[PDB]
């Protein structure tokens, strides 16, 4: 009820969002950086060949860590809906 | 006996009802479409039932242009109050949308302005957070109290009106931007530095950067930055509400 | 104001019809009382008077500000009342129909207005 | 004092008039002296008129409430 | 007591205001607003054909207001039907349990505000509050509680859209709409975490707590 | 006292005036919502 | 003992008011209509087939699915009541049985358990002890959940097509094109080459 | 056996109530309307032809297409009824036959089989005895499938134009130039040059 | 032969409902608003003038265009109706002829031939004997085609501006600059300096002649 | 003076066209188009809500019509009570300030075009322009004025965007999009100069 | 095998037979056929009117329900 | 080729013809014509009223159908 | 444990037994059984009529309230 | 039922008037029977008893020789009075029912 | 033009209403030469004309709203 509680639940929510999005974004960033440094080393420059492995890497990311995200988000939503009638004002 | 003078009761219960309902249809949270219409009408009716007997009853006939002028006056007062209150949520929405646009969340607006493809999800997040905060600080009760109080300042009876006063509400349009920047000034600045940092990376070996490494990094950085910045809005939320409220009090009179 | 003024003529005529019928019923009630001159009012003159100047009362025992005139007797009577029953019952029936006419006109006008305020 | 109070007062007055007429009618039917058929019949007439007045007031009041609840907000 | 004609007239007239009682004096209001907000949240503004939500809300309200209705029946309707309590006293006796429910859930700030707006004297205890003060205070408290519940409901369904948009943007697919991708995932979430049992139980507790 | 003639006439007016007020407000509210439902 | 004919007429003509409510809450109309709305959303176009066509088609599908229950009701309740062999109340009680069985067969256990908890029910016992006022909301909740389960997996192939087209377009280089615009004709192609309507009706009917 | 006059006019008014449903689910209105909506979406102009204009065009096209069926109903069914030669029941039965034949001509055997198997109908010898309750949903489903086929096929030339302009812009290095702004005028030019409106209406009429 | 007063009133009030249909399918309105719907797209601002402003401007332009037809209908048909020298049936027969001529002059022969063939009509001796059932949809089709022609032609100078601005941006190495936002103010410049609105309305009015 | 019921019918009917009066007769279109173009200028098509822009335009319209409202009150509102003039003649007298305003804000070319569209040859004087010719001409003039004001607003933001892109290119960056960098600078320029109040002052001066 | 159109047809036909029987009975009574009583004629006429009004009310309820079902936003 | 406009015109002409015949008969009866009876005049007027009411109801249903069809979102 | 369906069933029973009692009293009075009075028969019939009008009015109010509640949009 | 309580008094009065009417007509019919006693009921007491019958002998006025105590004039007046009161009770009961009806009609 | 025709129609309807009201007012005063049946017929004709005007207004307003709701 108190504004501290409101800001705490908002912060925890958006940290949950950060945890959900961090693996995919980080994998894409690492793949892009690796392809870019390889291009710099080989002196190859086309703006389209960096887009190819990124999709494959990010799609594999759901294969490997997808169940973890799905279990984390469901637990968050379940706990939020269960604690809903105790943060009422 | 058995009089029950109907015109007196109608004129006593009508104009306060018009003003209360005009505020209801525009005041934030009380004007959201999710409320059924009958609930809003009943709330206005009950508030008028509580308030009207204490006020001096007017005697202008409903079949006169004076009644039209009165109705226009009540509508103007109600919509002015509701809109001046809505300005704060407009400012919060502006700040959120700008943080989200510097996230690169909706890049299609820079190439196709207004092309049916826009999702200010951060703007919605902070808009609903602002609504929750407004509910917590009991702003709506204050709104109702001030709607009642504007009678003593401005009675139902037709009274003369002023000018630059309207400008004030229109000039409040500046606050939405000004205060909006005050909510976005820290985080955007660091994001700016991040983009500057990305520029330094592009000053190295040409191409092979931006649109491939900049977007995920800046997205994650914006996410965690403004997640940490969330505790900051509440003092600014109270500041915005106080600004709107005392501007309303000063200018309505 | 405008609606009040538009419906004022028929409303006042209907009120005057009611008062005239009260007077006629009083005449019918006192038809066998010895020494009772029948009373009646001039409807048109009193109606114009009430429109130009608003309705007023003698007191308020209360009674209207209408002029109670005496009816001319038809034939003499030893007891000394001028209530001739044929005249009383003809005026009663005529006033009845005219009051119903006033009700019809006023109701038609009020519907003729609800029809407009009906969207 | 209030509109609900005035409506309650009107209902109580109408019911009291109707009950008075009914009680006088029952007293006349009982055979008790002093109660005239003229007064019984006139009081029943007045009670019927008062009931009809109350019915009309209720009808309009309900119509006005329905009109207000149709108002757009 | 009133004549039987007057009692029948009053009963028939009072039968009219049933929607008003349901909307302004009952749990129905904060049993709907939440449903409308949730429907706005999932991205399907039609989905449960309204009527369905209205029927579910009616059944929920009937299950929730059961003790209040039972107390009214045992204290007011039963003596009135057995000719022990007059028609003008059954209403007063039955308006008290509803008034108490209306209090158990009505916040204070609202009570203080509407006690000030009526220029009424000090109310040292809750037993001095009339219905003219409790009615709009209860209405405002119910509106605020419903909006709080709906606005904490809204958060996960926007979180999913946020993460979907960020993931789409990592790979450079800037022209892909995020709402179309997020809607199936929002439906999947609301399926997984017992979307309705948890919401139903949370609302019911929100009343009985 | 006041007779049915006056009671009914004032009762009807009041009904007429209330209906007029309701209709005029409905027109004003519809116009306002049409203006605000715009697209800028 | 039997009701008077005037009472029977009053009850019969009053009960027709709950016909839309019966069709929506108690029959298969809700699930079919929700699935149809979700499928339009999934097609990429929000209002391609008018609401009228979908509503009529859902009504026909509901009638075809419920025809066995209607036949059972007619055999048990309507026919012996119309021949003046049973009373109205007993006919209604007898005819509530096949509809109760139909509602139970598609009811989630958790929904029934929760709504029995909220109705203070204690020793329930046989599946033939659940009252109608408890069974109905549980059936509605189960129908909503099942419709959502069907919709979110109906969404899958169109998301696959959208993602594949967007990935191919952006990897090829044309990142300024709107993928949905190019994807919509392919969604229609997939729907017509699979016989999406016929197979969807088959699946919806088989879901019972 | 002939219905009394009051029953006849009750039936007539009740049937007139169901007019939009008959237009949507028994005539060619639905397919034309779906194709028009898909075409409007295909040009990149979501609101260029107002809905009322397209609805009127579809209504007129439907009237022209169904003129032979209406003529058959008039000559075979309505005319004897208007001259009191036949009763209303037999007139309706005779008028059903041309409309069914038309609907059977434009239905798919697979959908008819699906609805027959779903409704547990007994074996039916030939197209002569197929209930309307079976034929109507099958015809609606077939119309939906055919409309989607036509729309998906129509979507092709505009896709060609979009792809060629996007490729031309991309091969010039113009990385941040969106192709929709350049493609829309050329889509309009393509549709104008081929006499698109009359050609598409003629194609829709010829398919019936 | 004249219809009764009740039937005349019924027919008049019934035909009053077809006013939007008559306006769209029989008057100039269809060509105007559609062009506006495209012009706001060419300028790069889908918001543009508000929808109601454009609709009312189209309505006024339509009235100005049909002023001669309306005057001819008023003179030939409605004036004897008001002055009692004609019936309702004969007035309906006579007043449509100028409007039929107006529709025919803007009707492409190919569409008219298509709808004849599709109605299986017999040999029409001359324009004067063309049925309204054949003239209406053909007129609507030709109207749509003409509106699309005008819109595509309108789309030209803004395409010129966009191409020039994009070429200038790319020739300087400023590849990452979206040219739409830069070229929008120059499109507004072009529409202002040349007096785009007045020129366009004059062109439309002259096109109908 | 004609019947009261007919007066009620006409009044409620004329109440329907209130959006038409606000859009076609007042200046509301000009402010709304200026706000839309300004929003398009900053690069954020949803930063202030459409509702807020509409309400701000409404308040600006009310102020800028306040002199015309006062003239209407003097010529129509007051004498309708003293009954020196009333009914349709008083309505026309009250509408006269609206003409004067719309004559002031209308260009001559639009009026000339709409006159030759109505074959009104003997329209010689400039205070007897009929409403049918005055209204659409006024709307077109308002559209032109709003577009001109929008371009004038566009100029500084376009300059800022061009400057940011040029410095990015000169500094060596060839891939960084200049819109992301230039957006906060656009906002800080808009706030620092207090763009909003000067914009409203100029709009009020623009009449 | 239960068809709602079949039941509607059956009810409509039954109403029609009642109306036709009452009409024929009144016809025969007017022609002075012995064995027909006026009271039975009026009673059967009133029963026919009651049946037709019941059909009217059922049709009104069904049409209203169909229009409420058919106007929902899908 | 059956046209709906022709059928509507024919129905309107039939309603107008019945109304005109009833009006003419009533006018002739008022003028003291011998071979016209009051019962026939009243019955013809009632039949014309019934026919015109049927026309009004059919028009209402047709207008409702048209306004429902033209309100689509295509 | 109150039951709205149970209360409606009890009210409908009250009306139906009142009507049946009046009907059986009329039955016995027509059959000629001693002890039944005509004024009592008429009074009981009128009481049953009043009870049925009570039921009809309550039905109207309940149906109107239900329709207005169910016509609302969330 | 509450409806019975409102109409109980008038129904009982009407039934008692009918019974006393039958008794008076029996007295008229048996005027010529030698040894017949004229019987009557006390309306008020029996109305109390039913709301919360016993026959009372009429006091003879003139002594006849055959033992018949029925007097024509007395019972003719009582018969006319009972008819009038029965009509009045019918009027009152009908008015009450009509009021209860117009309360409901709408 | 069109506004002129609407103004003429409204003027005719109001003249109808005024004539009926004046005739009824004169008849109320007892003025000779005015009969009750003529008064009632004129009142009913005025009511019919006013209802026709109301219906025409409703149709025109509905048509205007339908036209102005189009998506350009």
Author numbering:
A (entry chain D): 1 to 89
B (entry chain E): 4 to 256
C (entry chain Q): 3 to 62, 78 to 136
D (entry chain P): 32 to 104
E (entry chain J): 37 to 245
F (entry chain K): 65 to 104
G (entry chain I), H (entry chain H): 36 to 243
I (entry chain G): 36 to 244
What do the paper's sentences say?
Given the high fragility of the C ring, we examined several reagents as the media of density gradient centrifugation in the purification of the intact C ring-containing basal body–hook complex in the default CCW state from our previously constructed ΔfliCD strain of S. Typhimurium, which lacks the flagellar filament, thus avoiding effects of the filaments on purification of the motor. Local refinements of the LP ring, MS ring, rod, hook and export apparatus generated their high-quality cryo-EM density maps at the resolutions ranging from 3.0 Å to 4.3 Å. The MS ring is located on the inner membrane, houses the export apparatus and forms the assembly base for the C ring. In the intact C ring-containing basal body–hook complexes, there is one more peptide loop L3, which consists of the residues G310–P322 of FliF and is also extended from the β-collar region of the MS ring, bound in a hydrophobic groove that is formed by the α2–α3 linking loop of FliE6 with the D0 and DC domains of FlgC1 and FlgC6 on the surface of the rod. Thus, there are totally 11 FliF loops that extend from the MS ring to bind the rod in the basal body for torque transmission.
